[PDB]
Design a protein around this ligand. Sequence first.
Ligand code: ZN
Ligand code: ZN
Ligand code: ZN
Ligand code: ZN
Ligand code: ZN
Ligand code: ZN
Ligand code: ZN
Ligand code: ZN
Lengths: 347, 347, 347, 347
Amino acid sequence: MRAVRLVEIGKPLSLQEIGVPKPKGPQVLIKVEAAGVCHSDVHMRQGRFGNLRIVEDLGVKLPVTLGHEIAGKIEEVGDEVVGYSKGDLVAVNPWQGEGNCYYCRIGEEHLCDSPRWLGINFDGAYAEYVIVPHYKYMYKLRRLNAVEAAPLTCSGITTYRAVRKASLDPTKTLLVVGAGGGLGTMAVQIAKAVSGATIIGVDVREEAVEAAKRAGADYVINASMQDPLAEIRRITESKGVDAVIDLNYSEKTLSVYPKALAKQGKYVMVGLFGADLHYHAPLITLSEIQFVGSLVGNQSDFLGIMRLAEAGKVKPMITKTMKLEEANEAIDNLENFKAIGRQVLIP
Amino acid sequence: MRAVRLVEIGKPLSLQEIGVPKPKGPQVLIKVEAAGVCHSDVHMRQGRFGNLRIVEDLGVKLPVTLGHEIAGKIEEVGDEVVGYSKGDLVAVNPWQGEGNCYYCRIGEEHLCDSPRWLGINFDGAYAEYVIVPHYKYMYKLRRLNAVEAAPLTCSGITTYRAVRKASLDPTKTLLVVGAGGGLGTMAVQIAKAVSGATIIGVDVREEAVEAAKRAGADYVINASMQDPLAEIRRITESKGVDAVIDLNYSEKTLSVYPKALAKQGKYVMVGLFGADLHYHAPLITLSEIQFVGSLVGNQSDFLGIMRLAEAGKVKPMITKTMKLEEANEAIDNLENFKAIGRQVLIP
Amino acid sequence: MRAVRLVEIGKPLSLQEIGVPKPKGPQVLIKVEAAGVCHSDVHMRQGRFGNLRIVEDLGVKLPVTLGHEIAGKIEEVGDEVVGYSKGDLVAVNPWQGEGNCYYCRIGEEHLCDSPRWLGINFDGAYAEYVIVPHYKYMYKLRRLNAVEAAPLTCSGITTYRAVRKASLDPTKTLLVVGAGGGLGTMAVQIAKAVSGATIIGVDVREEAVEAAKRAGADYVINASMQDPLAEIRRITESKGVDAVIDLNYSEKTLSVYPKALAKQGKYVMVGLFGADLHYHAPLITLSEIQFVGSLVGNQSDFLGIMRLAEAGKVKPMITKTMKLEEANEAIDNLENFKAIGRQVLIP
Amino acid sequence: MRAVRLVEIGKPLSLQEIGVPKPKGPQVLIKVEAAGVCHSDVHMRQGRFGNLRIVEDLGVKLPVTLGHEIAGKIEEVGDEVVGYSKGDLVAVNPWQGEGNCYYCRIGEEHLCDSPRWLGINFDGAYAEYVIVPHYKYMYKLRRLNAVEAAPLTCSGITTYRAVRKASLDPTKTLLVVGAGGGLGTMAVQIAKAVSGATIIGVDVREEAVEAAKRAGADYVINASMQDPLAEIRRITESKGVDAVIDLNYSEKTLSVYPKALAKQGKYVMVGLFGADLHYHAPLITLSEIQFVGSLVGNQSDFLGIMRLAEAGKVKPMITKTMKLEEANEAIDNLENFKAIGRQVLIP
Ligand SMILES: [Zn+2]
Ligand SMILES: [Zn+2]
Ligand SMILES: [Zn+2]
Ligand SMILES: [Zn+2]
Ligand SMILES: [Zn+2]
Ligand SMILES: [Zn+2]
Ligand SMILES: [Zn+2]
Ligand SMILES: [Zn+2]
């Protein structure tokens, strides 16, 4: 099969012809129909995963096949696989744990001490076939097709968990920074579909602000025009928001929006963008605010988002299909910020 | 009656002879038997409450009578008071709310938009009598005497809530910074009495380290000798602690102990000590750690700690009784760090 | 003013001309614009409140003015009232606590040891004016008018809390029994607006089944035609529902629907309909199911539902306005089951 | 190896000489050093597991080797096993799931749709060796020896989870029925070690009542002498208990103790004893009480109890060691109620 792999750090990804794995035990072999590409892949091609080294820190034995956003048809199964048949359309949770550690025993597999992340330190979906270590990490698609589901295994589960960490309910108000972007609109849809909270979205361009409203935001704010903090104080009547979800934060967002927090407000940070949180401790203690990290998600999170998307209660991202061979080009577009919607490869 | 009050910011507290209030409605009049003094009172005499102004920010109309740590005998009751009689020994929750705001409706009275904090922006226990706005904020003492209960209305409820915000359970490990101090040993006792978690205490002097163990710490660390972080990694087998409770933190503690955090670990900050939290955002997101503020506590917290202390399940602080007239002297001792145990005035 | 009151148990309610109360302290005087009537009022006119005696058990000193569903204009305020002015349109939470007991201290006011329930053991809204003990129990209306808000202080807060006790999330499925009735459709709307869960509604007539779907049910079942349990097993693929909310249950519902429960499923019982729960203990233990009671709700619940209704995220019940003088007639209609929608009196 | 197995329902267990399994993949082979026997084994020898049929309902292919309480030395490992070596002393969690179903994905493995329960529908510890499907279900012993740990894999995890379902905290009071028995004292120790709640134990004989106090109960009640309900009302000052944990309940306990429940109280039912819960629905709704089932527990529960026992924070049951050959005799003793403490076989 064809495979686009990270052969040498720095250089561009290399197309190779390698053997097709034979699944044993609980393993499943998927014929890839959709392989999502996100900004994470820019870092990956560099050797890092958010200021790390898939090589030094995550023990990768180059080359590895990228592609952590996976959907496709079951091609073959090991003899321990139960509940799935050749031909089933499935999406795959790539954030897998080994089972024995603390995080795996308490149901936080994605935080496993020895992660098995498909597309990051295990061969991924940038190929005609990919091996799924255990069939339990799959979800049968009935409403969505591969292209629509694949991005959900990453952006879907990520914003789903962030909304959860926002501890929302009908009595609260949520601020989504960058609400007009791909991640942002996903967050808005998920918040509206599951919390009942009042949703405020803020973005910089007009199209974005428009998109956030379409996604279901109760209030939208163009930071280019009005003062975000002033508008939030107006809308919340000076209380502030009970939660902020800052998707792919920056030095900017982190220096601004924490000021919008209401007492007991939670500032949920997502993404690996290199920035530092500077903040006056006494402020944190007086207001009982909280800064909380969030990355990808667990089996429960995956189950939840897939259930929402298959229910139609949440809508597929704007995607742009491309060829397996255009992998580098797709990553370049993200590295240059010229990417249309979510780019998905079709082997 | 005699009252020691904050007449003029900066100057020392002034002894005055003023009228004894007559309780109406749900109000209760207490004859003060114990008036605790804590570092908070140092700031108070300065006009601030953790980088604030009881004058400008908290609307105080000087003079105010200090004393937010209150225990005593019921002297008289308004005609709406139910369930308490003249002569009852009670401790008092000073962190009162008005009832109508968000925080009051959700049971977080202490975070009320228009707080009624006895001893801070309402006359307190530095007097022979003090008025309690509503009888619901009291707890009848049966096992403890005034001197033993008074500190619990502040240090007791404060560490009780911090332990709660640490989200502990038997499968987790907790690090208490400054575990040998007054607050610190309180935290250790409360953690051991209610969480089942493994408790690690760290302090700087040997007596302190000894005190933390007596308080019930499973492990104690003298940071003066060994490397705290190395020892924690050993004890936790490299996982890190699931929670840190940093009582009266500093630039030091905040720059050191967050490194001991395990994934999903919570760093609970308490106290108003002027310092800033500097930390690399990507680290927060990868590890899903959380920085959480905590100040005083609510009716549930007060109820919980009082119930623990009256049960003997938690022990009274080391106290040092003094006279109402030695108020300034008592605050000076704290301002100079020469204070023995918790100083309590006895009008 | 005119007042329709319970003068003598058994007999019909009596119209009287009595004095208008003068609010003192935190009290508020409301000019009633909407006084809802629900089946609860049938029992009330009998002397009971769900197999009780407002007389013997709830200490009523007949006569009492009924009307626990209250909305109206502020006519006057005591001198302690803050944040509301003469003329404001408000809805009122009648399930008030005294403040001092366990339930009041932990934020469950409605379960207070010495309840102050307006319209049940305190004079209610069946009059031109009604006194609200404390202004904190109000919510300013901006979108809804009195008639639309009044029912929410009872059916709204009740189903809101039941949905909460159902512990729903996107990964779960909820069964609402009687989903076509007034309460039922309220439950469906609230579930859809705040949980993200898949919602299954079951009712007996076709109009009802239709109404449940309009309310937003994902699946509806006419028990008159198909087998409820078979259909649920189909829809849930044999798992069963994670929660059932049985509004105004009966011997029937209780003997049928608990069979639809999935493991760890919660059966939420609402209403005072006289029936007994019979069930095989071993079944409960093997499946870890739970039977949970729920009645009215607390300040947080009230806040949540009012916030949803004012947001439009939940819609007003079908109401039928009547005159204060038609009180008995309105209760008769419920006692005979000929009542149109929710009947609201307009003094 | 020797194995005592359920060859034919009804008849007594049969000693056989069968092959020793060879572990592959993540499997581990344990040399059994302790095989606990509990009342569950009485039902097992009958063909049922709490009104079921390991044959018809749980798909057993007789014969099966009993023994769901397992501790021992690692004899051999499959080539996928990580983190354990030949010779390690471990205890084993027998309540295993397959991974793919709802319950497995949300971290409730023990409620798996296709359970793998060692000693019940998979060969167990009544033998010289037993195969553990996956190494993640183990816990390395350092403080406890096999005999002390083995019972914890059942009675330990069971009461640990029940205490959890009791939702206790310092402000609450817990009633443990049968507090003097083996399970009962385990519950008391766990409650005291992890909740901070006031603990009331009730039992029938004096020795038992004495044992409950030793286990750490704050209050004990001999139902043979005093009226349980009267005493509870006294102790709780008429509030009632916030939770009851009824271990191996009966028609008796279920008809009595639910009356001790305080509002919002949880009645936690454990065990498969054949009885029905009869209770007046209106009572449940007015008081918001809850009836909750509980059986065994999950990986988190197992982790928690093992962590408590290895910490010494909870003490080993009173055990009585016997020989693998005395299996039937041991089950007979339980079937006749003449068993000393917890009987453990030593192959
Ligand atoms: Zn991605
Ligand atoms: Zn792991
Ligand atoms: Zn203090
Ligand atoms: Zn307030
Ligand atoms: Zn009503
Ligand atoms: Zn109360
Ligand atoms: Zn057992
Ligand atoms: Zn399963």
